[PDB]
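Input (structure):
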């Protein structure tokens, strides 16, 4: 401190000579060389300025990082004619992760399940949809033998309405009457031109029965997820969607929720449409109790006081009172629109 030479102060602060000499020029402190002695008040000023500038750097670098949100996994729904092997595909995907279980032990149905690959994790909504936005991607399954049917065209229209990206999966490619070329013509008739022919429709041959092609579907999902670059903020206000709800004799009202933003925690108050409660417990697809559920997580939630509806947005609220006010304001507004039916003009 009193008195320090510039090369000594540099060592102490971990700076290179020329950096400290630059700083002193910025401060207007004259010196002959790095061997010169500094007045105590100059050295002190240097120490303060360097501390601050380093504070500031760090603040800045933190900000740059914090504003880059982590990846969230792609959410996928499987759709198409119920006879075209949807459940066989879902089942196949559910098994490629119980290889030869732990185990075990243990599994729960919580509305969605995860498929892990070296390239990343995919979230599949459980039970195909006939049927808020839930899925990023809809896989439209079409049997090679049967071709595009009315259920197929409804699945396509619902997926498009919901804003999902389509992947066409032509299944049963090993039946003797399998005709994928016919399916592709049917697709092109409908404005879906396969990439093969220079169009934008993604078309993938699979067999849900043997699993042939299934790894290519997963790779394609993950590639699209990399390009769309799906991300979410785990510290935003928690937001989810109800996938389904039911009564348990033993447990009471249960609901499956998929988390989209923020992180829900046990003890949080939530409102979903007109239903509300305090999260008493959350259980994931492995049957584990979780204290927290962040983006992409599907969990069974205990604590709702009435059955929430499928597709309703789950919102964090600060307290019980807020939860009751929000749910109630929605209830009396619904009655209002309904009362705009009983009166005039039925
Ligand atoms: Mg809501």
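Output (sequence):
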């Amino acid at each position: 401190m009193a008195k320090v030479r510039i090369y000594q102060l540099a060592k102490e602060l971990g700076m290179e000579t020329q950096e400290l000499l630059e700083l002193l020029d910025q401060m207007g402190v004259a010196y002959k060389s790095h061997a010169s002695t500094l007045e105590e008040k100059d050295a002190e000023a240097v120490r303060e300025l360097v501390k601050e500038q380093r504070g500031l750097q760090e603040k800045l670098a933190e900000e740059e990082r914090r504003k880059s949100l982590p990846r969230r996994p792609p959410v996928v729904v499987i759709m198409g004619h119920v006879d075209h092997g949807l459940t066989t595909l879902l089942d196949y995907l559910r098994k490629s992760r119980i290889a030869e279980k732990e185990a075990g032990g243990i599994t729960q149905h919580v509305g969605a399940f995860e498929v892990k690959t070296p390239q990343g994790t995919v979230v599949f909504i459980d039970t195909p949809g006939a049927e808020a936005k839930v899925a990023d991607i809809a896989v439209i399954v079409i049997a090679a033998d049967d071709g595009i049917m009315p259920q197929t065209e409804e699945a396509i229209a619902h997926a498009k309405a919901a804003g999902a990206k389509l992947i066409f999966a032509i299944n049963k490619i090993d039946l003797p009457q399998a005709d994928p070329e016919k399916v592709k013509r049917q697709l092109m008739e409908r404005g879906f031109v396969p990439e093969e022919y220079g169009g934008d429709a993604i078309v993938i041959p699979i067999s849900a029965k043997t699993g042939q092609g299934v790894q290519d579907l997963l790779e394609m999902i993950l590639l699209l997820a990399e390009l769309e670059d799906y991300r979410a903020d785990p510290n935003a206000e928690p937001r989810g969607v109800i996938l389904e709800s039911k009564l348990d004799k033993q447990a009471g009202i249960i609901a499956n929720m998929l988390v989209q933003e923020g992180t829900f925690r046990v003890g949080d108050y939530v409102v979903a449409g007109e239903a509300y409660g305090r999260i008493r417990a959350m259980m994931d697809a492995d049957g584990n109790q979780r204290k927290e559920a962040g983006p992409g997580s599907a969990v069974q939630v205990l604590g709702f006081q009435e059955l929430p509806h499928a597709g309703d947005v789950v919102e964090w609220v600060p307290d019980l009172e807020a939860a009751k006010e929000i749910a109630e304001e929605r209830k009396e507004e619904r009655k209002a629109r309904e009362e705009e039916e009983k009166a005039r003009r039925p």
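Notes: The pocket of magnesium ion is lined by residues 271-273, 312-313, 315 (CB under 6 Å). The two ends are 89 Å apart (CA to CA).
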